[PDB]
Recover the amino acids of this structure.
C-alpha cells in the first residue's frame, strides 16, 4: 500500500525550499530517465556472484519507483515493472553468495510496495512467490544462512533484506513473517555490537555505509510496519556512529583513509538518518560539504542515492550552524582513532588524525600509530591507501592472509615502511599487537592524543609511546618515547608526502606544495640522519606512486635507553619556539 520505508506521509520531499534536495531530486529524475533508455539486467554470474545485477536492480527499482511516485509518468512505472518482472523470473538469486539474495529481495520488496497499485496481478503474484521461494525460504536453509551467527556486515545486509521482503508481503505470510522478524531482531544484535561504545567502525569510513544502511532499512521498516524498532536503535554506540563518520572526514574534506579505504568521501544517505534522529545539524554540515564536493556522476552512480532524500528531506540544509566540538575520540574499540581539527571551516585551520589498532581486523595496513596532518588546504602527511585486487592476485595470491609472514604485508602500500609511523631495521610491525589511545585532551591551545604502541613493536622495543599535538592552533608536534632492548637498533621515522622535499639542514626538511612551505623540524634525538626515500617499488606488481616521496630521518638508538624522537611540522606564519614535555 506503500508502507515499508518511504511512507506516504514522508513525501515531504515535495516541499522544495531547500536547494540541496531540489538539485538532488533533479539528479535522480535525470538518472531515472537514463534507465528508461536501457534494457533489463540479464542474469549473469560474475565470479560466482550475482551481486552486481542485484544492486543494479535495487538501484533502478529505487530510481524508477521514486521517480514514478513523485511524477506520475507511467513510463517510470512500466520500466520498473519490467525490471521487477524480469528479475522475479531469474531462476534463483544465487544463494551461494547470499548478499545477492539479500539485495535482490530488497529490490523486490521496495518495488512491490512502491508500485503496488500500478503493477499487475500476474506480477503481484509473481513477486510474492519470488520473494518467498527465492529469498525468504533459502534464508531458512542452514546451507546459506550462516551469516545469522556472524558479526560482520553480511548479518546486517541479509537480515535487512530478508526482513524487508517478509514485511512487504506480510499479509500473505503473517506467521512466517513473524518468525523472521523475531529472528532478525535477535541476530542483528551481533553486528550492531561492533559500534559500541562510541560508534567507531573498525574498517573505517568507506566500509561503513553498506551494513549501516541495511541496519537502518531494517529499523525504519520495523518502525513503519510493527510500530516499534524493538530497541535496536538503542544498542550502545549505534546512535553516535554518525558522529564517527562526521569526524572521519578531516579538514580538507577527505577521509582518514587508513587501510583499504579510499580518501574520497561521498554523500552518505545513512548520515541523514542519524542527523534526523539525534537532532544533529553537525552531521548535516559535513554532509552538505560532501555534496558541495561531489560530482553529478557519483550521486547518480550510488545504489542507495534515493535514501538520502527519504531520510534527509525532513530537514533543511540552509543556514547550518558551525559545529563547535573540535575533537572526537574512541579507545575501547578495534581501531582506536583520535580526530582533531581547530575549526570546522573546511580548508582552514589544522587537523590531525591518529590511529592505533591491530592488523588482525579487516582491511588493515601496518599503520598502528600512523597519523594524518592537514594544514589549510594541504594534506602534508598522507596515506597511500589500497592497491586494488587482482593487480596482485594473479601471481602470488593471499592478499587477505593477516599472519606475520603473509604476502599481504609484502605489498609496498601495506607495510609500515610506507605509512606515517615507525620501523626498526626495516622490519614490519608486529601484526598481532594492539594499540589504543591512552590519553587525549580538547584544550584548544594544545589539542593532543597519545597512543601506546608497545605491543605493535614487541620483539623490537621494550616500550613505544607516541603523542601528536596541535600547538596553539598553528603547528603540529609528534613525540615518540622509545625504550630500547639490548641491541643497537636504527629507528626510521617515516612520513608519506605529496610535497616537494628538500633536506635544508642536519635535522630539518622543508616541504613545498600549493605554493606554500612546511618545516619538518627534528628536535630529538641530538644526532639524526635526514632522509628521503623513493616511493616507487622495486617490484613490478606494486602500483606506481607518482608525486609521492617518503621523508623523515634515521637514528641509531643505544640499547637499554629511553630515547625520544621529536618532530615539529611547522606551517607558514609567526610562532614556534616551544618546549618538549609530554
Ligand atoms: Mn595505508
Amino acid at each position: 500500500l506503500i508502507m515499508t520505508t518511504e511512507d506516504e506521509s514522508v513525501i515531504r520531499s515535495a516541499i522544495q525550499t531547500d536547494g540541496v534536495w531540489k538539485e538532488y531530486h533533479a539528479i535522480m529524475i535525470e538518472e531515472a530517465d537514463n534507465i528508461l533508455g536501457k534494457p533489463n539486467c540479464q542474469r549473469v554470474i560474475l565470479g560466482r556472484r550475482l551481486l552486481e545485477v542485484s544492486r543494479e536492480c535495487l538501484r533502478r527499482t529505487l530510481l524508477l519507483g521514486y521517480a514514478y511516485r513523485m511524477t506520475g509518468e507511467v513510463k517510470y512505472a512500466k520500466r520498473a515493472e519490467s525490471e521487477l518482472d524480469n528479475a522475479a523470473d531469474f531462476v534463483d538469486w544465487n544463494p551461494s553468495h547470499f548478499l545477492d539474495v539479500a539485495e535482490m529481495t530488497t529490490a523486490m520488496a521496495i518495488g512491490y510496495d512502491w508500485l503496488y497499485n500500478f503493477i499487475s496481478d500476474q506480477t503481484k503474484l509473481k513477486i510474492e512467490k519470488a520473494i518467498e521461494t527465492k529469498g525468504l525460504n533459502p534464508s531458512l536453509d542452514s546451507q546459506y544462512n550462516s551469516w545469522l551467527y556472524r558479526n560482520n556486515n553480511w548479518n546486517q545486509v541479509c537480515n535487512g533484506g530478508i526482513t524487508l521482503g517478509a514485511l512487504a508481503i506480510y499479509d500473505k505470510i503473517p506467521t512466517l513473517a513473524d518468525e523472521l522478524i523475531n529472528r532478525a531482531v535477535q541476530s542483528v544484535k551481533l553486528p550492531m555490537s561492533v559500534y559500541a561504545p562510541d560508534g567507531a567502525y573498525a574498517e573505517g569510513y568507506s566500509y561503513w555505509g553498506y551494513g549501516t544502511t541495511y541496519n537502518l532499512l531494517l529499523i525504519d521498516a520495523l518502525e513503519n510496519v510493527m510500530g516499534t524498532d524493538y530497541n535496536l536503535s538503542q544498542e550502545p554506540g549505534f546512535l553516535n556512529t554518525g558522529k564517527f563518520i562526521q569526524n572521519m572526514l578531516l579538514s580538507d574534506g577527505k577521509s582518514f583513509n587508513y587501510g583499504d579505504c579510499s580518501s574520497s568521501g561521498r554523500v552518505s544517505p545513512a548520515m541523514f538518518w542519524f542527523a534526523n534522529r539525534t537532532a544533529d545539524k553537525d552531521i548535516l554540515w559535513s554532509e552538505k560539504y560532501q555534496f558541495s564536493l561531489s560530482s553529478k556522476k557519483s550521486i547518480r552512480s550510488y545504489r542507495y542515492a534515493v535514501l538520502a532524500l527519504i531520510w534527509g528531506a525532513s530537514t533543511s540544509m540552509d543556514n547550518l550552524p558551525k559545529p563547535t566540538q573540535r575533537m572526537w575520540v574512541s579507545s575501547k574499540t578495534t581501531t582506536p582513532v583520535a580526530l582533531m581539527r581547530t575549526t570546522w571551516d573546511y580548508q582552514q585551520g589544522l587537523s590531525i588524525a591518529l590511529k592505533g589498532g591491530t592488523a588482525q581486523s579487516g582491511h588493515t595496513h601496518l599503520d598502528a600509530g600512523s597519523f594524518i596532518f592537514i594544514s589549510k588546504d594541504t594534506r602534508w602527511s598522507t596515506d597511500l591507501g589500497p592497491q586494488d585486487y587482482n593487480s596482485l592476485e594473479s601471481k602470488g595470491i593471499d592478499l587477505w592472509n593477516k599472519s606475520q609472514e603473509s604476502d599481504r604485508w609484502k605489498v609496498f602500500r601495506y607495510n609500515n615502511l610506507a605509512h606515517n609511523t615507525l620501523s626498526f631495521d626495516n622490519k614490519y610491525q608486529n601484526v598481532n599487537g594492539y594499540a589504543t589511545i591512552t590519553d587525549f585532551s580538547d584544550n584548544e591551545n594544545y589539542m593532543y592524543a597519545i597512543a601506546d604502541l608497545t605491543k605493535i613493536y614487541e620483539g623490537q622495543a621494550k616500550e613505544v609511546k607516541r603523542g601528536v599535538a596541535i600547538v596553539d592552533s598553528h603547528y603540529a608536534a609528534v613525540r615518540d618515547e622509545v625504550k630500547t632492548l639490548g641491541q643497537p637498533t636504527v629507528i626510521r621515522w617515516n612520513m608519506v608526502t605529496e610535497a616537494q622535499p628538500a633536506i635544508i639542514g642536519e635535522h630539518t626538511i622543508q616541504l613545498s606544495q600549493n605554493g606554500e612551505k612546511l618545516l619538518l623540524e627534528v628536535e630529538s634525538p641530538a644526532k639524526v640522519r635526514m632522509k628521503t626515500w623513493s616511493a616507487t617499488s622495486p617490484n613490478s606488481w606494486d602500483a606506481k606512486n607518482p608525486g609521492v616521496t617518503f621523508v623523515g630521518f634515521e637514528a641509531e638508538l643505544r640499547p637499554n635507553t629511553t630515547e625520544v624522537l621529536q618532530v615539529k611540522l611547522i606551517p607558514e606564519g609567526n610562532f614556534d619556539s616551544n618546549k618538549e614535555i609530554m
In short: The two ends are 63 Å apart (CA to CA). Residues 327-570 form a domain with the Beta-galactosidase; Chain A, domain 5 fold (CATH 2.70.98.70).
